[PDB]
Each structure stands twice: as C-alpha cells, then as structure tokens.
Design a binder for this molecule. Structure first.
Ligand SMILES: [Ca+2]
Ligand SMILES: [Mg+2]
Lengths: 68, 141, 152
C-alpha cells in the first residue's frame, strides 16, 4: 500500500547505488589490468634474482652489463 | 621469448668476455675479463664456471647457459615502472605493508621463504620500501 | 543465452580476478559482484548474495564453471532506469526545480538503500565532477545521467 511505495523507493535507491558501484569498478578496471602485469613483472624478476644472485656467471654478467 | 634485445644483450656480453675474438670463451678470456673488473677468481673457480657448459663455450653454448635464467627478466626501467603502478603519487616508495601484501597474498603468491629472502636486505625505512633502490639491487652485483 | 563473445569476456575478467586473489583457477565468492560489474551489469548486493555471493573474503571460492551460472543468474537482475531515478530524487526535491542539497544527496547515497561508504560517495562525486552551487545545491539530473553513462 504505502508499504509498497516505501519499498519501491528503497529498491530504486538501491539500484542507483548499484549503478554507482558499477561505475566505480568499471573505472578501476584498466588500472587493475595494468597492475596485474606490473605485479607479474615484480614477482618474476624478484624470483629470477633469488636464483641468480649467488651464481658466479651472473655476478660476472651483471658487472659486464654496464660497460655494454 | 626470449626478446630480441635480450638476445642482443647476451651476444654483446659474450663478445666482450671473448677477449680473444676467438668465438669461444676460454679460461684466459675469463681471467682477462675478471682482472679488468677487480679480484680475479682462482683457476679452480674459473675451470668450474667453464664446466657448466657441456662443450667448448661458443655463443650458442653461452646462450644455453644463460637463456633459462634470464628469459623472464626485464630492464631496470620496466621493473621500476611496474612498481610505479602501485605508487599513484610517484613518491618512489611503497608502504612496506602494501608491497608485502601484494607479493604474498596476490598474483603468484610468494611463499614464506621467498618473503624472507626478499626482505632480508631490502631498503626499508620509516615503513617505506625504496623500490628504486631495490631495483638497483636486484639488477646489480 | 550467453553468446560466445560474452563467455570470452567473462573468462578474461575471471582470470584477472582469479590472479589478484592468488592465481589458482578460482575467484573468491566475495568478488562475484565485482566481476559481474566489470562485465557491464549493475547488480544490487542483494542480487549477488542471492546467487551465492558471500559477505567476507576467504569463506568460499569458485572455479570458472561454478562461476558461469552465478553470472547468468545475475545477468537479468533488475536495473534502474532514468525515469525510476528521477522519480526517486524528486521525493527529496523540495521545490521540484531539480535541485537537492549536497547533504541530502549524501544522505540518500550513504544513509538509505544499500548504503555506500563515504569514500565511495566522495569518489563518484569526484569522478563525475559533480559540484554544488554557493548555497550547496546540486542538480541531481546531471549526476544521474553521468553515473548512468559510465566512466567512458
Ligand atoms: Ca584466485
Ligand atoms: Mg676466445
């Protein structure tokens, strides 16, 4: 009755908030994809380092690298 | 991969270490290269380095020794920008708790031993992880 | 119902979210709504709970094939229209000129319905560049249109 009126107004508001939540997430999507690549780069490079840091060939290589 | 610039880097490193222009790296090339940089390891270290290659150390043998260990590595710049991704305001630091969380609980999770060895010598001060300096470290030595 | 174009998009987004929370071929059921938001639908939190969304991280995780049916379930959630939105803000419009105070606006977004956080409200207002006049009033029509048309 008047109950239905209040309930539909509450749903409408909630749908508008859904629209807002939608907007917020979709706006963050590109950064999320970019950050996924960034973190992949970070985890993989740290891991590669942990293996090669005590390998003599690498220690040579990294000293040669700056000289070209 | 591996990327062409990384192949080109490897070839250039091979070329410099091959002081002979031999097309091979032998113990003399290695001794020569090391003495030009500082302390020269003793013959048994050098011989052992060379023995990691199952044949005479050609460039293709050199590729064979480095390719797997270098394949997924990126430039200091790329890694620095990777970190930048999480540093919106470009402070050149990251909250220590933030980078620990990313590394340990997200993506390809670091296990507790990877976490320990990572932050052992990490440049962290005032709760701030210096990622520019960290990058220099993981690419240096 | 689901076109292959659509199923592909879902895979791409599932994988993104399946990595941010620890790559293991599963997505935390708490992120269900967020995955479906990236895909272009706007479910109410109640809608997502109804298809198996949880209230906290770490309670349950979904492999893709369990996730697909959640998405299909949400896919036809009721979505607000512009007319519904205007009718709703008009209940708060004191003189029906199309203005509401910025404070009433914050009241409806964070004090009613599926309440938004202050951060979320600050951010949507920031992103939509909604500004109030000297008496602190806003045109809700502009705001409704910008939210609906999306970040791009
Ligand atoms: Ca996962
Ligand atoms: Mg030679």
């Amino acid at each position: 009755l008047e109950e239905m009126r209040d309930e539909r107004l509450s749903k409408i508001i909630s749908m508008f908030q859904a629209h807002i939540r939608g907007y917020l997430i979709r706006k963050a999507y590109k950064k999320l994809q970019d950050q996924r690549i960034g973190l992949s780069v970070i985890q993989r490079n740290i891991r590669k380092w942990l293996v090669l840091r005590n390998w003599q060939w690498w220690k040579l290589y990294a000293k040669v690298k700056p000289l070209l | 991969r591996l990327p062409q610039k990384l192949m080109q880097e490897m070839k250039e490193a091979f070329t410099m270490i091959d002081q002979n222009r031999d097309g091979f790296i032998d113990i003399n090339d290695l001794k020569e290269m090391f003495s030009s940089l500082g302390r020269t390891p003793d013959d048994k270290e050098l011989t052992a380095m060379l023995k990691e290659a199952p044949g005479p150390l050609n460039f293709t043998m050199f590729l064979s020794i480095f390719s797997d260990k270098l394949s997924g590595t990126d430039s200091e710049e790329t890694i620095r920008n990777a970190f930048g991704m999480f540093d919106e305001l470009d402070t050149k630091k990251l909250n220590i708790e933030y980078i620990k969380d990313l590394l340990e609980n997200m993506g390809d999770n670091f296990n507790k031993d990877e976490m320990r060895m990572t932050f052992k010598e990490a440049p962290v001060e005032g709760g701030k992880f210096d990622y520019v300096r960290f990058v220099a470290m993981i690419k240096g030595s | 119902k689901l076109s292959q174009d659509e199923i592909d998009d879902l895979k791409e987004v599932f994988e993104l979210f399946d990595f941010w929370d620890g790559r293991d071929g599963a997505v935390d059921a708490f992120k269900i709504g967020d995955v479906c938001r990236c895909l272009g639908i706007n479910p109410r939190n109640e809608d997502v709970f109804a298809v198996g969304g949880t209230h906290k991280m770490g309670e349950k995780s979904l492999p893709f094939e369990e996730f697909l049916p959640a998405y299909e379930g949400l896919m036809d959630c009721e979505q607000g229209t512009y007319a519904d939105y205007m009718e709703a803000f008009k209940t708060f419009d004191r003189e029906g000129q199309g203005f509401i105070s910025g404070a009433e606006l914050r009241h409806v977004l964070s004090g009613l319905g599926e309440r938004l956080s202050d951060e979320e409200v600050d951010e949507i207002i920031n992103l939509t560049d909604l500004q109030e006049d000297l008496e602190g009033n806003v045109k809700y029509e502009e705001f409704v249109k910008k939210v609906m048309t999306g970040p791009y």
